[PDB]
Curated annotation (Swiss-Prot):
Name of the protein in its database record: Beta-agarase A catalytic chain
UniProt lineage: Bacteria, Pseudomonadati, Bacteroidota, Flavobacteriia, Flavobacteriales
Cystine connections: none
Gene name linked to the record: agaA
Source organism of this protein record: Zobellia galactanivorans (strain DSM 12802 / CCUG 47099 / CIP 106680 / NCIMB 13871 / Dsij)
Location of the active site: E128 (nucleophile), E133 (proton donor)
Membrane-spanning residues: none
Residues annotated as domain GH16: 2-270
Amino acid sequence: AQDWNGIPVPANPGNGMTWQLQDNVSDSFNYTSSEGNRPTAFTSKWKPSYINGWTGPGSTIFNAPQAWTNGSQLAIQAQPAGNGKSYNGIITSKNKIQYPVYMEIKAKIMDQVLANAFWTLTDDETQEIDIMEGYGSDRGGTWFAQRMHLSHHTFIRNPFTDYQPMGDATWYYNGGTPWRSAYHRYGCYWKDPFTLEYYIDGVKVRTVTRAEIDPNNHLGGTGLNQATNIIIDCENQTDWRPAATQEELADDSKNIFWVDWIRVYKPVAV
Ligand SMILES: [Ca+2]
Ligand code: NA
């Protein structure tokens, strides 16, 4: 039994193909775990830290105790750190994925000004896909509470230059309903280095084609081709957002990004 059994994959696997689950990056999180008490069902697939020693952007402090599971769901939690900062949960995959691949979570974002995201990043930190990035609280602006960011980045490193698409379709609106108010399925078909498709609740909402992938050639013509790491996290992005208050961070009814499951598939021959 897995939590998603019976729910179709919304993308087409191709002529004479079928979708096959990638076991080592899929999980129903149907076990109890925490710092000092992590079973093989978790540790064989996930680590409660970033892909390297960085502690995160702005007023973020990535911290292992803030990722845990409750018998049915993954909790990505925030806590007060004092002096204007937070402690922040994060998990990353121990195994990589690569196109062609369909990847999807079922999740409910926090009622906080903090970012909550499901994304990929390569070891060299040059290629990033943002399957979803949400900001749940009305205190950050109702405009943001009511929209889901769907994006990707290409970077030059050392020295640093960032590219992401900036079109209005990168922020998806659901009739005014805040994203904090329910669980949704957030999915992406990374079909090839120049093609991304985004799906919410099984419905295709956005396609990214070649001209929007890397128009400045930060990647030297490869597109989004490299094998990469999966990340699920929360962040206090004070480089551009208002800081979370310490009281908001202490409120255990508002400070958890809940993930019921993650599933990943690849197309294979029948
Ligand atoms: Ca579950
Ligand atoms: Na507002």
